[PDB]
Coordinates of C-alpha atoms and ligand atoms in Angstrom, one line a residue:
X33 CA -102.0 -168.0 160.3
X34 CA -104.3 -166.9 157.5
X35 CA -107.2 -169.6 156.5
X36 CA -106.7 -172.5 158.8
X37 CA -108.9 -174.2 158.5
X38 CA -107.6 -174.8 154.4
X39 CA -111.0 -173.8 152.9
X40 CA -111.5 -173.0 149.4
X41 CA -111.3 -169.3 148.4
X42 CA -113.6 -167.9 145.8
X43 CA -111.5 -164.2 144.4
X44 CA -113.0 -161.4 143.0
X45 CA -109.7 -159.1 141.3
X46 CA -110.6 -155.8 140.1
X47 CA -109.3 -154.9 136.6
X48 CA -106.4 -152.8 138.1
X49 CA -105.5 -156.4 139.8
X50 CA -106.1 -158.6 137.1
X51 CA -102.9 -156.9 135.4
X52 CA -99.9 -158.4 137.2
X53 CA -100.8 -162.6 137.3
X54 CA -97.6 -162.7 139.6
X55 CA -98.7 -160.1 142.2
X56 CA -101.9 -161.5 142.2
X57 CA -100.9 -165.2 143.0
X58 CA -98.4 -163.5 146.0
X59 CA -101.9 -162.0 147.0
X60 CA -103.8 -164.9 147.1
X61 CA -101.3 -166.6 149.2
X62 CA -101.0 -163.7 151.7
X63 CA -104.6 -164.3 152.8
X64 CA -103.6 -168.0 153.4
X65 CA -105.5 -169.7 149.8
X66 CA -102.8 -171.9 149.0
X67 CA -103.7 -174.1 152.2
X68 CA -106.8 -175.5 150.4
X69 CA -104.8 -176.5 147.7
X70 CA -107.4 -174.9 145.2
X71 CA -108.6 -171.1 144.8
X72 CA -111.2 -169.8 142.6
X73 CA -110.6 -166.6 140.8
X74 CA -113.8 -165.0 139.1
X75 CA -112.3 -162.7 136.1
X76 CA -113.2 -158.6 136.2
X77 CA -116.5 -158.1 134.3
X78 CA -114.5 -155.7 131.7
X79 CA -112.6 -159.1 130.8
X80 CA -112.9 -161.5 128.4
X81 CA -110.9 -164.8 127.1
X82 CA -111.7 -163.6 123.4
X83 CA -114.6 -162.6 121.2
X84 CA -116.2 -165.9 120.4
X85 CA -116.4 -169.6 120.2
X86 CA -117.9 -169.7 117.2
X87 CA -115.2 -170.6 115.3
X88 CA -113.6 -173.9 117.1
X89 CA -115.3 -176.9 116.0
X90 CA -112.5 -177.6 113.5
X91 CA -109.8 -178.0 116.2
X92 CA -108.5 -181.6 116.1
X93 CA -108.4 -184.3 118.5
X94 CA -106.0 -186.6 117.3
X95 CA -106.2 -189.0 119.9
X96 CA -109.5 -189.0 122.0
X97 CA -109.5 -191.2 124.9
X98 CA -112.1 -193.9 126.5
X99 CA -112.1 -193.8 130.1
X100 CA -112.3 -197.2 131.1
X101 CA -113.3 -197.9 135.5
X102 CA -112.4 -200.9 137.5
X103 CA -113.0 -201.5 140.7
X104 CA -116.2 -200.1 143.1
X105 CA -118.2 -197.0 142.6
X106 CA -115.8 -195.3 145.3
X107 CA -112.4 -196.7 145.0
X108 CA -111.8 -197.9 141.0
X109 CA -109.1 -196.7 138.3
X110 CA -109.3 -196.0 134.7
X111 CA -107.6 -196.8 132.0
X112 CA -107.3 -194.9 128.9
X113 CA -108.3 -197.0 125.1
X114 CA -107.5 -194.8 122.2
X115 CA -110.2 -194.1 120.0
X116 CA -109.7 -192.8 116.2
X117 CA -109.7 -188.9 116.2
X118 CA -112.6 -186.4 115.7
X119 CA -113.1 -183.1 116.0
X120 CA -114.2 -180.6 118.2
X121 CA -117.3 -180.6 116.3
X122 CA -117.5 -184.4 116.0
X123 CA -116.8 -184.5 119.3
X124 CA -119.5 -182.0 120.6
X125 CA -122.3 -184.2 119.0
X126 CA -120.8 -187.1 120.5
X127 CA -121.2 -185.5 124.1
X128 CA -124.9 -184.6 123.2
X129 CA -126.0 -187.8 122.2
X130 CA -128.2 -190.1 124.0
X131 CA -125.6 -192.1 124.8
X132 CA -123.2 -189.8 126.4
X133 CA -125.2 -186.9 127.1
X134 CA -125.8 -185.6 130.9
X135 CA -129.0 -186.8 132.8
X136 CA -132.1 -184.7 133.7
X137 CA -131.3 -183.4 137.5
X138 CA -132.0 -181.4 140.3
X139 CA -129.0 -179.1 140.6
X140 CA -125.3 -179.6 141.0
X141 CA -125.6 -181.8 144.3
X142 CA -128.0 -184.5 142.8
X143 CA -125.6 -184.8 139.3
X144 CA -122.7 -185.2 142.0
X145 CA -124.6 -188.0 143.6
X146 CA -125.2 -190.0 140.0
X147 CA -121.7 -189.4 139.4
X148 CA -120.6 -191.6 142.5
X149 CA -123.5 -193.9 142.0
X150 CA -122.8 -194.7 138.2
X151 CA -119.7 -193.3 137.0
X152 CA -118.1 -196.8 136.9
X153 CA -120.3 -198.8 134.6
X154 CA -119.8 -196.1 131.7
X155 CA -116.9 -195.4 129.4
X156 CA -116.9 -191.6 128.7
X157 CA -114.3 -190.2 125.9
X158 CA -112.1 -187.3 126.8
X159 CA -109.8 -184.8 124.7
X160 CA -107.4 -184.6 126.9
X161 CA -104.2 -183.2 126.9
X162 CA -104.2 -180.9 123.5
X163 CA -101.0 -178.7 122.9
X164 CA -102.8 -175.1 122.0
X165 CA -104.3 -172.3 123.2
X166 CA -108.2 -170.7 123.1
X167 CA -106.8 -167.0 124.7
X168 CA -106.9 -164.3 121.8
X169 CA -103.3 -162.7 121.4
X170 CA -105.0 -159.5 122.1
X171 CA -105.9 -160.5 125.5
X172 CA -103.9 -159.1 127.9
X173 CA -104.4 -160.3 131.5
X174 CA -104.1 -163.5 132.4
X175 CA -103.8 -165.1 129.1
X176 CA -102.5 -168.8 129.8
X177 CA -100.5 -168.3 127.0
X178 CA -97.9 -165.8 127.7
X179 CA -97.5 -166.3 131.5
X180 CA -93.6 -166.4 132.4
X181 CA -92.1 -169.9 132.1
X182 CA -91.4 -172.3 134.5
X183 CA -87.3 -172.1 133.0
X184 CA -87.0 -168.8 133.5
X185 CA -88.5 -168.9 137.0
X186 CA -85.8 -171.2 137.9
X187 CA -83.3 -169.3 136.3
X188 CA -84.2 -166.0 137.8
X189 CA -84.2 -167.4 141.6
X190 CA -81.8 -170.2 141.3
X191 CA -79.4 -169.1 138.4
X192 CA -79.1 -171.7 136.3
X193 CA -80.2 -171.7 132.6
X194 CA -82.1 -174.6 131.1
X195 CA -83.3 -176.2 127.8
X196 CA -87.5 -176.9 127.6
X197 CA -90.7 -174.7 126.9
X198 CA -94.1 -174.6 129.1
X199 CA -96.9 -174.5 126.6
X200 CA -100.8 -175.1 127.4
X201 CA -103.0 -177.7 126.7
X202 CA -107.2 -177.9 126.0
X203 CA -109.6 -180.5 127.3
X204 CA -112.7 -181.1 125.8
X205 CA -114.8 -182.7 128.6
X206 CA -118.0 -184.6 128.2
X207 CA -120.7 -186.0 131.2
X208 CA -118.4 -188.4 133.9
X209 CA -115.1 -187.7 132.4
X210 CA -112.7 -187.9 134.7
X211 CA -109.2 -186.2 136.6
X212 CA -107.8 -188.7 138.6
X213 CA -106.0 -187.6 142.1
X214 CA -103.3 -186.3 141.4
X215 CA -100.2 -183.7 142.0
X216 CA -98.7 -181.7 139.0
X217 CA -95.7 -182.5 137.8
X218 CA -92.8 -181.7 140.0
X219 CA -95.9 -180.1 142.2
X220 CA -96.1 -177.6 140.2
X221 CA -99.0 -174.8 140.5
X222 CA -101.7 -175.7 137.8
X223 CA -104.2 -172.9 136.4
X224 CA -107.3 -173.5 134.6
X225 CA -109.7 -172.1 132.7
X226 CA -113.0 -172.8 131.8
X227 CA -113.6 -171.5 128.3
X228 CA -117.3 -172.9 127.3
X229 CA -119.7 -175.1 128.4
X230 CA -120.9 -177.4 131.1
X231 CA -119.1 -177.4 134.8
X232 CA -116.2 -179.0 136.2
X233 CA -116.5 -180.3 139.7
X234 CA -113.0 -180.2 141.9
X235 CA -111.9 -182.0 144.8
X236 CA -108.8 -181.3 146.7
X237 CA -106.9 -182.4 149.6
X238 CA -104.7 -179.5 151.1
X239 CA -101.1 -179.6 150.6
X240 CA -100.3 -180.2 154.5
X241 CA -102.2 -183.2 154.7
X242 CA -101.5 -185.1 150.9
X243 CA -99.6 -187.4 152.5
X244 CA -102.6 -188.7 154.6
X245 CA -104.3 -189.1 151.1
X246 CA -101.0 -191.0 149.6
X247 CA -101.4 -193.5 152.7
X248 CA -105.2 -194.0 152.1
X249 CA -104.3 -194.8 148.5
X250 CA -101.1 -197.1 149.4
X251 CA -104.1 -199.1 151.4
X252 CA -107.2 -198.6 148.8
X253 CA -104.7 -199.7 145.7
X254 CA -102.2 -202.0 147.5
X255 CA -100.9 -203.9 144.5
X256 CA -100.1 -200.8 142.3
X257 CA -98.5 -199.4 145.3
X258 CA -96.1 -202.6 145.6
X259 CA -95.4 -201.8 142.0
X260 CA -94.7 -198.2 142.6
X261 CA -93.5 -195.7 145.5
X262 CA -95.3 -192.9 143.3
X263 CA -97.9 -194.5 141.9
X264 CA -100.3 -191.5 142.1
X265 CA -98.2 -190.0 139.2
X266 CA -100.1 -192.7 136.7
X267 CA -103.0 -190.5 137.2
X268 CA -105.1 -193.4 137.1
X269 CA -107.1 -193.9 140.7
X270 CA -110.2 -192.4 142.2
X271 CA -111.5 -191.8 145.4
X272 CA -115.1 -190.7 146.0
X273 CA -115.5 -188.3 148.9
X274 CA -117.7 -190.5 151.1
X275 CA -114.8 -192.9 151.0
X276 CA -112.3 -189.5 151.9
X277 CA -114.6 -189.1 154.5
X278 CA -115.3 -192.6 156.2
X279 CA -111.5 -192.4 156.4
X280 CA -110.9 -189.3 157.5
X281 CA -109.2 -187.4 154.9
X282 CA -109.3 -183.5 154.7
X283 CA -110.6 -182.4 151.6
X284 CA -112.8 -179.4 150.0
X285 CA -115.1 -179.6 146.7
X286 CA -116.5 -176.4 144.4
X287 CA -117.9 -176.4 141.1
X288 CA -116.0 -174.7 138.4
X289 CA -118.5 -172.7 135.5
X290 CA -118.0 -171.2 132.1
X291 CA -115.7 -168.0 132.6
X292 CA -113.9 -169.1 135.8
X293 CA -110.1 -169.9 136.7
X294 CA -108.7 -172.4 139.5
X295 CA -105.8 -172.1 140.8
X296 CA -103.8 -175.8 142.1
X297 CA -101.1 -175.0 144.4
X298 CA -97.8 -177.0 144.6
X299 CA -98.7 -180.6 146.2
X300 CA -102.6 -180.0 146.3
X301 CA -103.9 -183.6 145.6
X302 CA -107.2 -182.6 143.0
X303 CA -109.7 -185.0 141.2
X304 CA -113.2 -184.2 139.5
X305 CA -115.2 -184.3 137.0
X306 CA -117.0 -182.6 134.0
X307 CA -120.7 -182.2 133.9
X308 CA -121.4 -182.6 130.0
X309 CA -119.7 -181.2 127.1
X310 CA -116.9 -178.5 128.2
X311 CA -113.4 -176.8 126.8
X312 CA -110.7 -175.5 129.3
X313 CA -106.8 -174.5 129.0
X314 CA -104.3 -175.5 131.3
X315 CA -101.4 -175.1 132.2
X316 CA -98.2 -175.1 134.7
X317 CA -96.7 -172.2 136.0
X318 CA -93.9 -171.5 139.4
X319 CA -93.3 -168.9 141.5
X320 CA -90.1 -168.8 143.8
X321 CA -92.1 -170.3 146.6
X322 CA -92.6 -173.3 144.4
X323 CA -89.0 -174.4 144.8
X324 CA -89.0 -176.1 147.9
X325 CA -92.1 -178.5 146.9
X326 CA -90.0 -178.7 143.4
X327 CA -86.8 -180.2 145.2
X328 CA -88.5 -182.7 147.6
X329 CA -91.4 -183.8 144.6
X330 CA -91.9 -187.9 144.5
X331 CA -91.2 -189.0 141.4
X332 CA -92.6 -192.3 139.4
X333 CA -89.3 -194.2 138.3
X334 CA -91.7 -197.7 137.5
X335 CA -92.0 -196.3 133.9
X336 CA -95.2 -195.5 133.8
X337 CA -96.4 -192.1 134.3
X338 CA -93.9 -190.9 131.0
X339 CA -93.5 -187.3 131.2
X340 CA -92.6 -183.8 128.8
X341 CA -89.4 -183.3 127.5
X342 CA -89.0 -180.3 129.9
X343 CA -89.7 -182.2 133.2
X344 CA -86.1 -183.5 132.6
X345 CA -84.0 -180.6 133.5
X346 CA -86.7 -179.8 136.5
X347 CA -85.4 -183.4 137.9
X348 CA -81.3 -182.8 136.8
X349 CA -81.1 -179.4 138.7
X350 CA -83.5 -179.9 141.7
X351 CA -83.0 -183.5 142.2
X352 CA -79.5 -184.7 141.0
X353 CA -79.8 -187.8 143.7
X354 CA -82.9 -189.1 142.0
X355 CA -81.9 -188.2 138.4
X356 CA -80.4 -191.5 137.3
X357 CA -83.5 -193.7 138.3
X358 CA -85.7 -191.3 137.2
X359 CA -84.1 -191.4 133.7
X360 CA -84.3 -195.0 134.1
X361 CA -87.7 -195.1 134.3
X362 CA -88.0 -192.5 131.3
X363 CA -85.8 -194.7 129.1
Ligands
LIG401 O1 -109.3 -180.4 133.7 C1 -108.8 -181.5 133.8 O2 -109.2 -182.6 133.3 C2 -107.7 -181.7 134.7 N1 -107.0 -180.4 135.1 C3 -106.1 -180.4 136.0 O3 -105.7 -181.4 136.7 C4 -105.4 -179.1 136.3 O4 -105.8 -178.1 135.7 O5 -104.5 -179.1 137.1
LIG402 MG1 -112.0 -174.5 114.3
LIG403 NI1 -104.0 -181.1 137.7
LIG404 ZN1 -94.8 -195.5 138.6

C-alpha cells in the first residue's frame, strides 16, 4: 500500500506532465497521495497562470465577509457579518493597514503560533467565494477554468445526463482569515491555486480517519451537533492542532505560497489559514474514483449549509433515498 502512513506529498510535474490534469491526478493517486487527504503540486518552471497581476484591483467584492470567533482559542466557530462591498484594491489596503495587517515574526512556525494564540479576539474580513477566474485563456495546462465538469464526469461513467455548470471561485485572503474544517460538497476533490501574495497554511485529516474527526467535533460542539447530523457542512467550527493532537486525531499541515496548487481529495477534512493579503481560485472537480465517496456523502438537511444549484442533481442521481429531506432542507 503506497504512503501509509497518509503524509503530505509535495509533486514536481515536468511540462510533458503538466499537460493531461486527469493523468496526472490518476498519477498522484498511484503513489498513494490521496491518503493524506491533501497533495501539493509545484507547477513546471516553463509555466505560468498568466502575465501579470497588475491589472486586478478593480475586481469586485460584492459581499466581503467579517469573520466573527466564539468560543476558546482552540475550539470556537465563526460567524460571517456582511460588510458593504470594496474592491480588490480597497480591499488590499484594508489587509495592509495597521489594523489588519500581519505581525512582525520569526518564520512560518512562530506566525502559526499567534494564530492559535489570538486568532479569536479579532474579526478579519474575507472575499470569499467569488464566481471568476484569474487563469489567462491562453493558458493551457491546468487552467481551473476549463477542467472537465463534474456533469459530464457523471455522465461519462454513470450514463445519465444532468442540468448544472462547475465554475471557479476567488478568495482574497487577509492575516487570520479563516477555512473552517470541512469536506467539499458531495466530497468532492477541491484544487487550489495560489495566485499572489502571502501564504495559506492547510490542515488536513486523511480521508480514512474523518470520521474520528466528525466524533471529536460531535463532542467539542455538542449542541450544534444535536441540531444537526452534518453539521460540519455549515463550515463554521475550528479545531487547533494541539487540540487534534491532545485527542488523538491524525492530521498533517503544509504551507501553501504564491505559484503553488493543492489538491483536496474526496472526504479529506481541511482547515487553515491565510498569512496576510492573498488571491487564489478554486474549484471542484471528479474523477470516476470519486463516485463511491459521492454516493455515501453526509449531507446537512437542518437548512443551513444552503448549497449551488448544481449540488441538486449530484444528490437526485447518487442519493435518491436522501433526496426528499435534502430538498427539505434546501426549501
Ligand atoms: O482557500 C480557502 O479559503 C478555502 N479553500 C478550500 O477549502 C479548498 O480549496 O477546498
Ligand atoms: Mg481589475
Ligand atoms: Ni475546501
Ligand atoms: Zn445542518
Amino acid at each position: 500500500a503506497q504512503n501509509p502512513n497518509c503524509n503530505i506529498m509535495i509533486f514536481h510535474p515536468t511540462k510533458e506532465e503538466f499537460n493531461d490534469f486527469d493523468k496526472y491526478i490518476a498519477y498522484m493517486e498511484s503513489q498513494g497521495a490521496h491518503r493524506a487527504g491533501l497533495a501539493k503540486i509545484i507547477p513546471p518552471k516553463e509555466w505560468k497562470a498568466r502575465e501579470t497581476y497588475d491589472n486586478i484591483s478593480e475586481i469586485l467584492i460584492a459581499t466581503p465577509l467579517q469573520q466573527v470567533a466564539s468560543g476558546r482559542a482552540g475550539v470556537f466557530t465563526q460567524y460571517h457579518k456582511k460588510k458593504k462591498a470594496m474592491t480588490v484594491g480597497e480591499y488590499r489596503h484594508l489587509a495592509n493597514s495597521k489594523k489588519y495587517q500581519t505581525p512582525p515574526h520569526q518564520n512560518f512556525e512562530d506566525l502559526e503560533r499567534k494564530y492559535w494564540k489570538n486568532r479569536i479576539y479579532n474579526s478579519p474580513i474575507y472575499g470569499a467565494d467569488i464566481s471568476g477566474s484569474l487563469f489567462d485563456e491562453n493558458t493551457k495546462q491546468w487552467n481551473l477554468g476549463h477542467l472537465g465538469t463534474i456533469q459530464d464526469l457523471l455522465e461519462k461513467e454513470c450514463g445519465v445526463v444532468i442540468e448544472g455548470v462547475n465554475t471557479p471561485y476567488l478568495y482574497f485572503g487577509m492575516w487570520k482569515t479563516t477555512f473552517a474544517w470541512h469536506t467539499e460538497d458531495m466530497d468532492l476533490y477541491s484544487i487550489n491555486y495560489l495566485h499572489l501574495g502571502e501564504p495559506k497554511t492547510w490542515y488536513v485529516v486523511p480521508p480514512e480517519h474523518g470520521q474520528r474527526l466528525e466524533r471529536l467535533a460531535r463532542e467539542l460542539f455538542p449542541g450544534s451537533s444535536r441540531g444537526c447530523g452534518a453539521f460540519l457542512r455549515h463550515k463554521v467550527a475550528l479545531i487547533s492542532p494541539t487540540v487534534l493532537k491532545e485527542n488523538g486525531i491524525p492530521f498533517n499541515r503544509i504551507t501553501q505560497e504564491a505559484g503553488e496548487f493543492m489538491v483536496t481529495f474526496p472526504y479529506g477534512y481541511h482547515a487553515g489559514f491565510n498569512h496576510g493579503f492573498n488571491c487564489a481560485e478554486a474549484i471542484n472537480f471528479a474523477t470516476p474514483r470519486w463516485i463511491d465517496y459521492g454516493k455515501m456523502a453526509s449531507q446537512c438537511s437542518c437548512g443551513e449549509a444552503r448549497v449551488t444549484f448544481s449540488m441538486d442533481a449530484f444528490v437526485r442521481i447518487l442519493q435518491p433515498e436522501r433526496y426528499d429531506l435534502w430538498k427539505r432542507g434546501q426549501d
